[PDB]
């Protein structure tokens, strides 16, 4: 088999979108409220999540067919998938050696302990770390990583989605280019596509647990006041 | 003349309230999003204003009779006076030499230029600097400074105020202790009380200009997203 020019241009647009929205230098992290090592890590991690949401919006706008959707569908997909894309894209900084996300200096080295200092419990942090480990072990090509983010965002089974048909057609076209990429470009990846689809189910379960834990902190004004307007809007329950 | 035990205990409660809420070390300023020298100073100054609002709430709760008022009246007084109290209390860091607010290191030295980098124009910054200069030249005792803040906050002529009678009785009692303090404790202050009352009128005009300029930035989501939830709530138009 061989993949078409149409499938090849989808890949080209997605890796270009990811290169424009993911700053490998982590140079903007100095602009966030500093890390502090109750809920001492909440200001810094709220700033990091807020910055990541902007990057996800930027990536989403460069996905073919996303901008063409209605503003309501664009908002529904982002409000629902935002946290899953953040967890996926965070895998680029994840280190199997330290079991932490490393973003330049030791100031931006986030371990499991720093995340408990932002209000999270091991009911979320245990499956999240186990997710990062298994994702990293997949040794995904940049092409597969970006296709997975685009498939995750363009999921039609999200609350608020009106044009299910159109969104599923965009997601199916993205799954086809992923299956064909793995088949012809990934050596010994006969089981990879199925493993990647399982990671999407794991993300749904992580989103569930994150929504529960976020609800716990958003209901305490002394904690919610530490979040950013963008985090409040995106993780909010407004329809 | 001599002032009573009741007037003396009002003074004692107010300077104690101010000492509890005004950190002369400015040690928390390191926790704000760093200063950047469009609207590069907005994150840092939004964090500084947000922190100052919390300190004003803390001061207000220690004013005799404030906590006794209804939650609605407490909110109306703070939503209306918050920016005037911030401008008053900022006078402690103001330097006549540099024509700037100095808060420890040169990182927390705010000149007129840094404030334009947060969205403000000279239509506000010119009367604000001229206000700080004249306030500093009054050489107010700590007792007078704290009484002025309490009189400013307990103004009955604010939108949303229901118990005007009660609030005016609290403000009149505060004005009486100020007049008696200046008379018996401030040498050569026969013209001071009138000069202090004029500074309150100047504050109203500064609040007007600040509300206009804040409206200009709150209506631009790319700027309003840089504010904090507490700044949005307090400077907001919700009733």
């Amino acid at each position: 088999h061989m993949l078409s020019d149409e499938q090849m241009q989808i890949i080209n647009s997605l890796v270009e979108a990811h290169h424009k929205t993911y700053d490998d230098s982590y140079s903007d992290f100095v602009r966030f409220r500093p890390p502090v090592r109750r809920l001492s890590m909440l200001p810094h991690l709220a700033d990091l999540v807020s910055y990541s949401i902007q990057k996800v919006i930027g990536f989403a706008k460069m996905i073919p067919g996303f901008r063409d959707l209605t503003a309501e569908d664009q908002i529904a997909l982002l409000k629902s998938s935002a946290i899953e894309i953040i967890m996926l894209r965070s895998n680029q900084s994840f280190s199997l050696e330290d079991m932490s996300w490393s973003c330049g200096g030791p100031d931006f080295k986030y371990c499991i302990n720093d995340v408990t200092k932002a209000g999270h419990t091991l009911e979320l942090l245990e499956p999240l770390v186990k997710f990062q480990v298994g994702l990293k072990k997949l040794k995904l090509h940049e092409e597969e990583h970006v296709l997975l983010m685009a498939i995750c965002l363009l999921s039609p089974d999200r609350p608020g989605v009106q044009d299910h048909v159109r969104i599923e057609a965009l997601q199916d076209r993205l799954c086809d280019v992923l299956q064909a990429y793995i088949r012809i470009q990934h050596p010994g990846g006969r089981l990879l596509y199925a493993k990647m689809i399982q990671k999407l189910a794991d993300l749904r379960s992580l989103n569930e647990e994150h929504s529960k834990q976020y609800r716990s902190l958003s209901f305490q004004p002394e904690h919610s006041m530490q979040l950013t307007p963008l985090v409040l809007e995106v993780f909010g329950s407004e329809v | 003349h001599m002032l009573s035990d009741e007037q003396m205990q009002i003074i004692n409660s107010l300077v104690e309230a101010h000492h509890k809420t005004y950190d002369d070390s400015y040690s928390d300023f390191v926790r704000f999003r760093p200063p950047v020298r469009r609207l590069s100073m907005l994150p840092h100054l939004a964090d500084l204003v947000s922190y100052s609002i919390q300190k004003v709430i803390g001061f207000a709760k220690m004013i005799p009779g404030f906590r006794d008022l209804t939650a609605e009246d407490q909110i109306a007084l703070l939503k209306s006076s918050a920016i005037e109290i911030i401008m008053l209390r900022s006078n402690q860091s103001f330097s006549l030499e540099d024509m700037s607010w100095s808060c420890g290191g040169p990182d927390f030295k705010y000149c007129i230029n840094d404030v334009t980098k947060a969205g403000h124009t000279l239509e506000l910054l010119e009367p604000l600097v001229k206000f700080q200069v004249g306030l500093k030249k009054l050489k107010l005792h700590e007792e007078e400074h704290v009484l002025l803040m309490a009189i400013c906050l307990l103004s009955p002529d604010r939108p949303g105020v229901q118990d005007h009678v009660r609030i005016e009785a609290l403000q009149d009692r505060l004005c009486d202790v100020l007049q008696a303090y200046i008379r018996i404790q401030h040498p050569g202050g026969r013209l001071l009380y009138a000069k202090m009352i004029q500074k309150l009128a100047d504050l109203r005009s500064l609040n007007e200009e600040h509300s206009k300029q804040y409206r200009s930035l709150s209506f631009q989501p790319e700027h309003s997203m840089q504010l904090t939830p507490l700044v949005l709530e307090v400077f907001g138009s919700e009733v």
Partner: peptide, 10 residues
């Protein structure tokens, strides 16, 4: 409402 989201989406 989604004022920020609407703005960021152009």
């Amino acid at each position: 409402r989604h004022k920020i989201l609407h703005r960021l989406l152009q």
